[PDB]
Design an enzyme around this catalytic site. Structure first.
Site, mmCIF file in Angstrom:
data_model
loop_
_atom_site.group_PDB
_atom_site.id
_atom_site.type_symbol
_atom_site.label_atom_id
_atom_site.label_comp_id
_atom_site.label_asym_id
_atom_site.label_seq_id
_atom_site.Cartn_x
_atom_site.Cartn_y
_atom_site.Cartn_z
ATOM 1 N N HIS A 126 3.608 -3.292 13.040
ATOM 2 C CA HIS A 126 2.254 -3.345 13.600
ATOM 3 C C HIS A 126 1.408 -4.487 13.029
ATOM 4 C CE1 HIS A 126 0.492 -0.826 10.129
ATOM 5 N NE2 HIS A 126 -0.493 -1.651 10.401
ATOM 6 N N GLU A 176 0.128 -15.464 -4.958
ATOM 7 C CA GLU A 176 -1.314 -15.219 -4.957
ATOM 8 C C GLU A 176 -1.817 -14.122 -5.862
ATOM 9 O OE1 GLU A 176 -3.308 -17.437 -1.537
ATOM 10 O OE2 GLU A 176 -3.609 -16.682 -3.521
ATOM 11 N N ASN A 184 -5.939 -14.187 -6.630
ATOM 12 C CA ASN A 184 -7.263 -14.199 -5.916
ATOM 13 C C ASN A 184 -6.945 -14.848 -4.565
ATOM 14 O OD1 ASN A 184 -9.754 -15.155 -4.772
ATOM 15 N ND2 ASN A 184 -10.681 -15.177 -6.685
ATOM 16 N N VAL A 193 -9.340 -18.077 -3.705
ATOM 17 C CA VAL A 193 -9.365 -19.269 -4.628
ATOM 18 C C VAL A 193 -7.970 -19.848 -4.871
ATOM 19 C CG1 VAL A 193 -9.901 -20.076 -7.021
ATOM 20 C CG2 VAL A 193 -11.366 -18.330 -5.862
ATOM 21 N N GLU A 247 0.473 -20.832 -5.931
ATOM 22 C CA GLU A 247 0.540 -20.492 -4.504
ATOM 23 C C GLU A 247 1.488 -21.402 -3.749
ATOM 24 O OE1 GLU A 247 -2.539 -21.205 -5.956
ATOM 25 O OE2 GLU A 247 -3.929 -19.683 -5.335
ATOM 26 N N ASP A 253 8.396 1.271 11.983
ATOM 27 C CA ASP A 253 7.337 0.250 11.702
ATOM 28 C C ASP A 253 7.831 -0.733 10.596
ATOM 29 O OD1 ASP A 253 4.794 -0.961 11.800
ATOM 30 O OD2 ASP A 253 3.891 0.556 10.548
ATOM 31 N N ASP A 269 -5.045 5.997 -2.934
ATOM 32 C CA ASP A 269 -4.230 5.819 -1.692
ATOM 33 C C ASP A 269 -4.247 4.333 -1.318
ATOM 34 O OD1 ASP A 269 -4.741 7.125 1.687
ATOM 35 O OD2 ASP A 269 -2.890 6.568 0.639
ATOM 36 N N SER A 270 -3.461 3.979 -0.335
ATOM 37 C CA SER A 270 -3.437 2.584 0.125
ATOM 38 C C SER A 270 -4.499 2.714 1.257
ATOM 39 C CB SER A 270 -1.987 2.216 0.598
ATOM 40 O OG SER A 270 -1.456 3.291 1.359
ATOM 41 N N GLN A 307 -6.622 0.264 4.707
ATOM 42 C CA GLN A 307 -6.511 -0.945 5.596
ATOM 43 C C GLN A 307 -6.562 -2.245 4.791
ATOM 44 O OE1 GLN A 307 -9.839 -1.226 8.258
ATOM 45 N NE2 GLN A 307 -10.869 0.341 7.143
ATOM 46 N N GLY A 308 -5.664 -3.119 5.125
ATOM 47 C CA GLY A 308 -5.547 -4.424 4.447
ATOM 48 C C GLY A 308 -4.265 -4.362 3.629
ATOM 49 N N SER A 350 -1.494 -2.461 4.731
ATOM 50 C CA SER A 350 -0.345 -2.302 5.681
ATOM 51 C C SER A 350 0.668 -3.446 5.540
ATOM 52 C CB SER A 350 -0.811 -2.326 7.156
ATOM 53 O OG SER A 350 -1.774 -1.289 7.383
ATOM 54 N N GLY A 351 1.921 -3.108 5.595
ATOM 55 C CA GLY A 351 3.002 -4.134 5.482
ATOM 56 C C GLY A 351 3.451 -4.341 4.043
HETATM 57 N N1 LIG Z 1 -4.446 5.672 4.315
HETATM 58 C C1 LIG Z 1 -3.439 4.834 4.217
HETATM 59 N N2 LIG Z 1 -2.457 5.079 3.377
HETATM 60 C C2 LIG Z 1 -3.395 3.673 5.012
HETATM 61 C C3 LIG Z 1 -2.421 2.655 4.788
HETATM 62 C C4 LIG Z 1 -2.347 1.482 5.552
HETATM 63 C C5 LIG Z 1 -3.262 1.353 6.539
HETATM 64 N N3 LIG Z 1 -3.435 0.383 7.376
HETATM 65 C C6 LIG Z 1 -4.461 0.757 8.087
HETATM 66 C C7 LIG Z 1 -4.946 0.026 9.168
HETATM 67 C C8 LIG Z 1 -6.144 0.366 9.790
HETATM 68 C C9 LIG Z 1 -6.620 -0.354 10.862
HETATM 69 C C10 LIG Z 1 -5.908 -1.431 11.338
HETATM 70 C C11 LIG Z 1 -4.686 -1.839 10.761
HETATM 71 C C12 LIG Z 1 -4.013 -2.949 11.315
HETATM 72 C C13 LIG Z 1 -3.740 -3.014 12.695
HETATM 73 C C14 LIG Z 1 -3.108 -4.108 13.274
HETATM 74 C C15 LIG Z 1 -2.726 -5.173 12.483
HETATM 75 C C16 LIG Z 1 -2.981 -5.139 11.120
HETATM 76 C C17 LIG Z 1 -3.612 -4.041 10.555
HETATM 77 C C18 LIG Z 1 -4.239 -1.073 9.667
HETATM 78 O O1 LIG Z 1 -3.071 -1.361 9.003
HETATM 79 N N4 LIG Z 1 -5.001 1.926 7.790
HETATM 80 C C19 LIG Z 1 -4.202 2.272 6.790
HETATM 81 C C20 LIG Z 1 -4.314 3.453 6.060
HETATM 82 CA CA LIG Z 2 -5.408 -17.858 -4.558
#
Ligand SMILES: NC(=[NH2+])c1ccc2[nH]c(-c3cccc(-c4ccccc4)c3[O-])nc2c1
Ligand SMILES: [Ca+2]
Ligand SMILES: [Cl-]
Length: 223
Positions: A40, A52, A54, A57, A62, A84, A171-172, A174-175, A177-178
């Site tokens: 995704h 990386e 920071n 910066v 890098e 995924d 927890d992990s 958004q940002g 993911s991957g």
């Molecule tokens: N609670 C968790 N452990 C968690 C982990 C990874 C997540 N990633 C995200 C997420 C939320 C909105 C958009 C993306 C996203 C969608 C498309 C491309 C890149 C990121 C997310 O990965 N929520 C997440 C929540």
């Molecule tokens: Ca940097």
């Protein structure tokens, strides 16, 4: 990462930032020309950023390399997020050293209770958005399948596992993911989804990498 700590510069040498003018997902370096991330996180115009700490910066170490191709798993389902996983080939190989190193793929799946390290530049607040400049880390255990399925009834497939704390707080998010979930030096998971971030009884769900090793190996060998 919510409730984690600052990793320390280059202490997670296999972590990469996928960039398209801003950081949008994390990934793991598994050899000098390939990265594993989540399906995704796919988009075109991906620049992989290695060494990386920071991400706003240039501090040194890098390596910015463009992706030559991204291979989303053919059975990836965007509605369930089953399968995924994505592989990214780099235009040129990265120079590996102590700050940029790959992580090993597992030979067996991990058991509940295994403690792992999750890292990333994702949101650090559960209620709000605060994105860090440097890499954050969180140590979290893999939960049993019953607790995971009891938390997300009907949404966990055999290619997913939960890791985290049911009390909430860590927890992990958004940002992240991957990115990587490393246990005993092997890449066991990829940050995939969750309900909110760090909420009580809603642990994070990860892609179970041990289930894709032959696929990763075969795919790399033919590309
Ligand atoms: N609670 C968790 N452990 C968690 C982990 C990874 C997540 N990633 C995200 C997420 C939320 C909105 C958009 C993306 C996203 C969608 C498309 C491309 C890149 C990121 C997310 O990965 N929520 C997440 C929540
Ligand atoms: Ca940097
Ligand atoms: Cl079920």
């Amino acid at each position: 990462i919510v409730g984690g700590y600052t990793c320390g510069a280059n202490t997670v040498p296999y972590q990469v930032s996928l960039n398209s003018g801003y950081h949008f997902c994390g990934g793991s370096l598994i050899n000098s020309q390939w990265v594993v991330s989540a399906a995704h996180c796919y988009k075109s115009g991906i620049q992989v950023r290695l060494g990386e700490d920071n991400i706003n910066v240039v501090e040194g170490n890098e390596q910015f390399i463009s992706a030559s191709k991204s291979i989303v798993h053919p059975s990836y389902n965007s509605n369930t997020l089953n399968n995924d996983i994505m592989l990214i080939k780099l235009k040129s190989a990265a120079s590996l050293n102590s700050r940029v190193a790959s992580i090993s793929l597992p030979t067996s799946c991990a058991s509940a209770g295994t403690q792992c390290l999750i890292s990333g530049w994702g949101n650090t607040k559960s209620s709000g958005t605060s994105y860090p400049d440097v890499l954050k880390c969180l140590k979290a255990p893999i939960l049993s399948d019953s607790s995971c399925k009891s938390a997300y009834p009907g949404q966990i497939t055999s290619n997913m596992f939960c890791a985290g704390y049911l009390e909430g707080g860590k927890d992990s998010c958004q940002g992240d993911s991957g990115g990587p979930v490393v246990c005993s030096g092997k890449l066991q998971g990829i940050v995939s989804w969750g309900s909110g971030c760090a909420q009580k009884n809603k642990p994070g769900v990860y892609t179970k990498v041990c289930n894709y090793v032959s696929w990763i190996k075969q795919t790399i060998a033919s590309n």
